[PDB]
């Protein structure tokens, strides 16, 4: 019956399935484990460089807080 | 980890390609009162590797008198702009974010129709290089009535970046704003990638077959962000990304339900559609679309 | 760098993908055994052409919408799009779209 | 040793793809085109089988004659055939393409297909009923199951 | 079938249209001089391989005018039927056939299906699904078996509802519309002086039928 | 008596101009095609699971040819040469001579079934019920010589199917 | 509803001798329905009938996997038949 169309479909479903979800883990695991920064405008660019010089291991993720003001 | 991200990226559609054939035929004849195939494999799942085996095993018929320069660039062309129309678009995050992704699947768009022209002028056929003539027609003919809905959609986004439409329609979805550009843009993605009702027209060959279905795939992911906005929760993605292949795999499906329901339109009918009745919509939409954020105080932000 | 290695990857893999259909059937053995020009074909990619180049002039209206000259921006916008409309409507009436 | 394994193992992956996989154009000049296509039809349903219906002369592995071959269209069946890949089968449908049938003594009718193409299934009939063709069709697979290819090219 | 067609295009528009036919003469007419009226009755079947048994019917109806003498009752009564069931069999045929040609191709597996179920009612009365040899000079070859009028009956009940599936597919469908109206129009006057007969003519107005 | 097919005249008040308009702009008639598809798409296919299920046959089917014989063993055919005399596709060729007891009978009876028409006609000429067109029709061949049918392969046909071939005849027999 | 037919397809499993004997007739006979045996055949086909199906799914057999000489696990076709079974499956009588 129809049903049977529903194997197929799916293993379409799965493959559409692995880009998205894929970036996701990766931009987590590149970044952090927080969402990628994403840079228009060369405002938030300039954002993004501030925090990579105070960071100090040259990675714009690794965050300093308030603890870092002394 | 950038190669594995495109990779992931690459492999994937070929597989979702390769079975959208299966798929199509199964549900054509599901339509039509029989099965597709089903022997092949437990629910002829081994349909599409046999398929592709038997297609990469038998002898190319090379024209013996053709160029075979652009005999063989062509294929790669198409192939090539197939797979980056992809990396734009976001599910929900996007492989490469660029400020201007629209703009630049209009323009892989633009480029799409020179595989079409030189493999009709490497055919050394009068009628061959005819058909293609044809085809390149109604292509650029109908990518015009693209171009403008797609600014038209877009005047209520406030960019050219495919991310902020996923932001736009948090609360409705742009199908409720603008059916009539929604129904226009169907149907010129319909003539866009030669479906029915506007199909007029071993190896290389198997490779506009992927280029062609990888196309028709991406045209249904760019109209299901387009215009049916999946919600997005920044702290679990995966369900924006099942929405959106939910809503791709429902458009793809409804691709094939035109196919299998309709006669084919003549080529002075579909040309005349278009030049006669989707051109002057189209612009009046335009117009109406470039007023109404103004006329309603209701102007997008970003700029 | 990113998005040309992007490029690279697909144009690579394309090559690559079609390089081994083409030759996959090559190893083995085997036998190995005009003027009409239509004017219309012409026409209607002109026509493509003209409106493309208007739509190009058209395409920055996303962010022409943030000038405070709204009244200024609007008049030009829809002027723009009637001149659209005009030269598809003498196009029409000069029966440049017939087959 | 494992050099005959893996030419096996080879050959039978081959087989199996082209076999599950057999894309027909048909000559439908008589009557038996109309038990072909009923073949097609939901209750026989040979695409189920991965057989498409109507692939192009370009891309098409088997060549169904399905009717009688007269004297006037044997050049554009040989030519048809001269012009498809080369993994390519004859398969004849009915008493007109087996052996002229009821026209077999006509002065404009050729008397069977296999005059002007080598011919790897005859199904007999008239015309054979679309079940029949469907059997003739499996036969066919069958018999490219038999063969091997990669062994010979081996022990030659 | 096989056709072979020498165009002369301006455009797109047709200038001149020339079929050259004769890629199926067997030369029917000829073999059928060397036997007798049963042996040559089978030909008839072979002529318009759509619908076989109105073929069958003209023979023999010829033969029977020659002859001088009448089917019963009853055969008659078989022929008209088994004649209206083959005239249901040709229309499904062409419409259908003219529709996948123009593209729909959905309604030719539709009623390919109520096609094969005509085929059980030919194979059942002769033991040939199409080319029975059914109907003889003298009237019918064998007489119906005992359930065959029911299953027509059963057949025949259903079948109004798939004609009307297939119009809901063509009818009204705009595509389909500007595929056939106003195109290959003939006037009476040229149908009538052209040769032409059956609906080619009443597709025109002309008020006749055999 | 006579129907009239297109003679139909559209309404022309506003409510019927406005149905036409909103059938052309909103695309009522191919939402409604598309309706019928999907309709036909949720019910049973008629595909049957050919080689495992089989098509309806009758008892008056015609296939392969058989010889058949008597119930003491011996065959029918007397070569009386009316199923050669009546074949419309002059398929059959057929030699005899008294045999060592006196009968009547074959020493030849070839079958060209890439001739045959398969019109039953032979089956129906023979007075002894010899020649059969029995009901198998999957034989399928990958030579065209091994269709060229003679005495033996006849018989092993009959000798083969005579037990079908027996009960179809039993079953129709009376209708002729 | 859905958990009715859920159960059909548990028992479609469980009637077929397990898993094994389920999975060998889905690959073998690409079918994997049950119905009542009717007969046994002394080259080893198995016939089987459901009244419930549609005429021409209401019949069936299943082949033997070892015919005369050669192995028939996959290598089935309709000529191994033989007549009487013949005659009964292609719906020229009643009566097996
Ligand atoms: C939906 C999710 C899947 C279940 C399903 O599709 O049921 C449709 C089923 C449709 O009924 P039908 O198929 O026309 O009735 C035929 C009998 O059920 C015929 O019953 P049957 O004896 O053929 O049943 C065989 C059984 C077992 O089938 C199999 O195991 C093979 C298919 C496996 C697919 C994986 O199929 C199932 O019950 C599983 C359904 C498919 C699940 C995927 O009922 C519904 O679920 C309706 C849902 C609402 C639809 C809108
Ligand atoms: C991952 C690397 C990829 C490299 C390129 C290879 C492409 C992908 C390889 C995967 C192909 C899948 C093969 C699966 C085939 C099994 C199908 C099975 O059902 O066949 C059965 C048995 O068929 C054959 O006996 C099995 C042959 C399968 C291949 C044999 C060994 C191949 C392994 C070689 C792999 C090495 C690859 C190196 C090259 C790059 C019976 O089917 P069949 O009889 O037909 O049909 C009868 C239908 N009935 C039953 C209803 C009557
Ligand atoms: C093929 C397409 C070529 C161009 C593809 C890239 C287009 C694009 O918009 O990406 C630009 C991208 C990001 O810009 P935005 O999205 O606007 O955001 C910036 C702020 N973060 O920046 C870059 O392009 C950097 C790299 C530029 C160098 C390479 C550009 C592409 C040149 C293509 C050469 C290949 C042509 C060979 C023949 C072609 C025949 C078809
Ligand atoms: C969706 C996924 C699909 C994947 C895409 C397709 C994957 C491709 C897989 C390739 C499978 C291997 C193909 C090998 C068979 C090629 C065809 C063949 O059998 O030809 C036999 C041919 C006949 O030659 P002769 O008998 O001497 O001359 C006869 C003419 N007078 O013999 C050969 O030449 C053998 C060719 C070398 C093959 C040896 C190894 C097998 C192939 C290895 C894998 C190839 C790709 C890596
Ligand atoms: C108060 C403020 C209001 C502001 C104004 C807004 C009001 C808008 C009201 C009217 C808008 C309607 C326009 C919709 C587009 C109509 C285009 C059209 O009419 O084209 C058709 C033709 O369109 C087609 O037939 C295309 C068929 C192609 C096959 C597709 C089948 C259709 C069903 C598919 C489903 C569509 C799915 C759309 C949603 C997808 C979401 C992504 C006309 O053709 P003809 O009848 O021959 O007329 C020519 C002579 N006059
Ligand atoms: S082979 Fe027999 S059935 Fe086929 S067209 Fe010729 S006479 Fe008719
Ligand atoms: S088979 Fe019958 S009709 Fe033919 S020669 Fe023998 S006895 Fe006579
Ligand atoms: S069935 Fe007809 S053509 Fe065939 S042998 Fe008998 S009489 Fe001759």
Redesign the interface.
């Given at each position: 019956?129809?049903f049977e169309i529903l194997p197929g479909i799916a293993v379409m479903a799965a493959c559409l399935f692995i880009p998205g979800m894929a970036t996701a883990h990766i931009h987590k695991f590149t970044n952090g484990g927080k969402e990628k920064r994403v840079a228009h405008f060369s405002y938030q660019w300039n954002l993004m460089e501030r925090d990579r010089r105070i960071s100090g291991v040259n990675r714009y993720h690794v965050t300093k807080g308030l603890e870092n003001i002394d | 980890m950038f190669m594995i991200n495109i990779l992931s990226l690459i492999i994937p559609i070929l597989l979702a390609v390769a079975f959208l054939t299966l798929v199509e035929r199964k549900?054509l004849?599901?339509?039509?009162?029989?099965?597709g195939p089903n022997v092949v494999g437990p629910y002829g799942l081994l349909q599409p590797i046999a398929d592709a085996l038997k297609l990469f095993t038998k002898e190319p018929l090379r024209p013996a008198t053709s160029s075979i320069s652009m005999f063989i660039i062509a294929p790669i062309l198409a192939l090539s702009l197939a797979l980056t129309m992809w990396v734009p678009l976001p599910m929900p995050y996007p492989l490469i974010n660029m400020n201007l992704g629209v703009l630049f699947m209009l323009a892989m768009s633009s480029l799409a129709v020179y595989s079409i022209l030189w493999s009709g002028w490497a055919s050394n056929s009068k009628y061959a290089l005819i058909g293609a003539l044809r085809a390149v027609a109604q292509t650029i003919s109908y990518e015009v009535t693209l171009a403008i809905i797609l600014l038209s959609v877009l005047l209520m986004n406030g960019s050219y970046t495919l991310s902020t439409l996923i932001t736009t329609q948090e609360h409705i979805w742009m199908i409720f704003t603008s059916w009539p550009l929604a129904?226009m843009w169907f149907i010129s993605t319909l003539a866009e990638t030669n479906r029915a009702p506007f199909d007029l027209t071993a190896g290389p060959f198997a490779m506009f077959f992927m280029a062609e279905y990888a196309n028709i795939i991406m045209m249904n992911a760019f109209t299901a962000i387009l215009f049916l906005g999946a919600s997005h929760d920044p702290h679990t993605p995966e369900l924006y990304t099942i929405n959106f292949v939910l809503k791709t795999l429902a458009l793809t499906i409804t691709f094939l339900?035109?196919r299998?329901?309709?006669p084919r339109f003549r080529y002075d009918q579909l040309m005349h559609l278009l030049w006669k009745s989707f051109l002057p919509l189209t612009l009046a939409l335009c117009m109406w679309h470039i007023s109404l954020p103004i006329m309603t105080a209701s102007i997008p932000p970003q700029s | 760098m990113n998005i040309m290695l992007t490029l690279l990857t697909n144009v690579t893999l394309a090559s690559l993908l079609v390089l081994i259909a083409f030759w996959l059937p090559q190893l083995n053995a085997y036998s190995e055994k005009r003027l009409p020009f239509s004017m219309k074909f012409f026409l209607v990619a002109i026509t493509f052409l003209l409106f493309d180049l208007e739509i190009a002039l058209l395409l920055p209206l996303p962010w022409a919408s943030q000038t405070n000259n709204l009244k200024t921006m609007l008049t030009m916008a829809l002027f723009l799009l009637i001149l659209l409309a005009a030269s598809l409507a003498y196009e029409w009436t000069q029966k440049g779209l017939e087959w | 040793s494992r050099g005959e394994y893996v030419v096996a193992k080879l050959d039978d992956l081959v087989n199996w793809a082209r076999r599950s996989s057999l894309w027909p154009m048909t000559f439908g000049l008589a009557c038996c085109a109309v038990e072909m296509m009923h073949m097609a039809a939901?209750?026989?349903?040979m695409d189920?089988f991965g057989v498409v219906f109507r692939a192009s002369p370009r891309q098409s592995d088997v060549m169904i004659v399905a009717g009688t071959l007269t004297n006037k269209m044997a050049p554009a069946l040989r030519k048809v055939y001269d012009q498809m890949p080369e993994p390519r089968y004859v398969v004849s449908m009915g008493?007109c393409a087996?052996?002229?049938?009821?026209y077999?003594?006509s002065y404009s009718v050729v008397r069977?297909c296999?005059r002007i193409v080598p011919?790897?299934?005859?199904?007999?009939?008239?015309p054979?009923?679309?079940?029949?063709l469907?059997?003739?069709i499996?036969?066919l697979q069958r018999?490219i199951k038999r063969e091997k290819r990669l062994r010979i090219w081996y022990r030659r | 079938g096989v056709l072979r067609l020498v165009m002369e295009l301006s455009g797109e528009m047709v200038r001149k249209c020339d079929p050259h036919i004769g890629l199926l003469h067997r030369g029917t007419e000829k073999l059928i001089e060397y036997?007798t009226y049963?042996?040559?009755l089978?030909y008839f079947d072979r002529l318009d391989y759509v619908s076989m048994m109105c073929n069958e019917q003209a023979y023999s109806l010829a033969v029977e005018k020659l002859l001088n003498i009448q089917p019963p009752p009853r055969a008659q009564w078989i022929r008209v039927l088994f004649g209206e069931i083959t005239r249901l069999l040709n229309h499904i045929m062409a419409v259908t056939t003219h529709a996948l040609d123009i593209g729909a191709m959905?309604p030719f597996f539709?009623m390919f299906?109520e096609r094969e179920k005509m085929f059980?009612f030919y194979?059942?009365?002769?033991?040939?699904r199409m080319?029975a040899?059914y109907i003889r000079p003298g009237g019918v070859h064998?007489?119906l078996?005992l359930g065959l009028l029911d299953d027509i009956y059963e057949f025949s009940k259903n079948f109004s509802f798939r004609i009307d599936?297939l119009e809901?597919?063509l009818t009204?469908?705009?595509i389909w519309r500007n595929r056939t109206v106003d195109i290959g129009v003939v006037t009476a006057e040229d149908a009538l002086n052209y040769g032409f007969s059956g609906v080619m003519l009443r597709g025109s107005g002309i008020?006749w039928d055999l | 008596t006579?129907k009239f097919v297109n003679m139909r005249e559209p309404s022309m008040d506003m409510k019927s101009v406005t149905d036409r308009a909103a059938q052309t702009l909103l695309?009522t008639?191919?939402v409604?095609?598309?309706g019928?598809?999907?309709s036909?798409?949720?019910?049973?296919?008629?595909?049957?699971?050919?080689?495992?299920?089989?098509?309806?046959?009758?008892?008056?089917?015609?296939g392969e040819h058989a010889l058949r014989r008597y119930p003491s063993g011996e065959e029918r055919c007397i070569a009386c040469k009316l199923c050669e005399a009546?074949?419309?596709?002059?398929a059959i060729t057929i030699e005899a001579e008294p045999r060592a007891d006196g009968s009547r009978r074959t020493t030849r009876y070839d079958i060209?079934?890439?001739?045959?028409?398969?019109?039953?006609?032979c089956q129906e000429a023979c007075p002894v019920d010899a020649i059969v067109?029995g009901?198998?029709?999957?034989?399928?061949?990958?030579?065209?010589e091994?269709?060229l049918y003679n005495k033996e392969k006849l018989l092993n046909n009959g000798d083969?199917?005579?037990?079908?071939?027996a009960?179809?005849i039993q079953?129709d027999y009376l209708?002729? | 509803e859905l958990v009715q037919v859920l159960r059909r397809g548990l028992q479609q499993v469980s009637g077929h001798g397990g898993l094994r004997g389920y999975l060998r007739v889905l690959f073998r006979?690409?079918?994997v329905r049950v119905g009542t045996l009717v007969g046994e055949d002394k080259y080893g086909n198995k016939y089987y009938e459901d009244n419930k199906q549609?005429?021409?799914?209401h019949?069936?057999?299943?082949?033997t996997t070892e015919m005369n000489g050669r192995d028939t696990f996959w290598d089935?076709?309709?000529?191994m038949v033989p007549?009487?079974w013949?005659?009964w499956?292609?719906?020229?009588?009643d009566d097996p």
């Open positions: 019956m129809w | 549900v004849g599901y339509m039509q009162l029989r099965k129904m339900w035109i299998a329901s309709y | - | 939901p209750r026989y349903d189920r008493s087996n052996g002229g049938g009821y077999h003594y069977g296999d011919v790897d299934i005859y199904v007999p009939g008239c054979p009923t679309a079940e029949a469907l059997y003739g499996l036969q018999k | 036997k049963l042996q040559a089978p959905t539709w299906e059980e194979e059942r009365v002769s033991g040939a080319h040899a064998q007489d078996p599936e809901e597919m009204n469908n705009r008020q | 006579y695309w008639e191919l409604r095609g598309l019928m598809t999907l036909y798409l949720f019910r049973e296919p008629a595909t049957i699971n050919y080689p495992f299920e089989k098509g309806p046959l009758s008892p008056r089917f015609r009546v074949c419309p596709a002059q060209d079934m890439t001739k045959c028409i398969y019109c039953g006609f067109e009901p198998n029709f999957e034989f399928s061949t990958e030579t065209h091994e269709l083969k199917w005579e037990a079908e071939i009960a179809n079953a209708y002729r | 006979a690409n079918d549609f005429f021409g799914r019949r069936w057999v299943i082949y089935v076709d309709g000529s007549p009487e013949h005659r499956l292609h719906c020229m009588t």
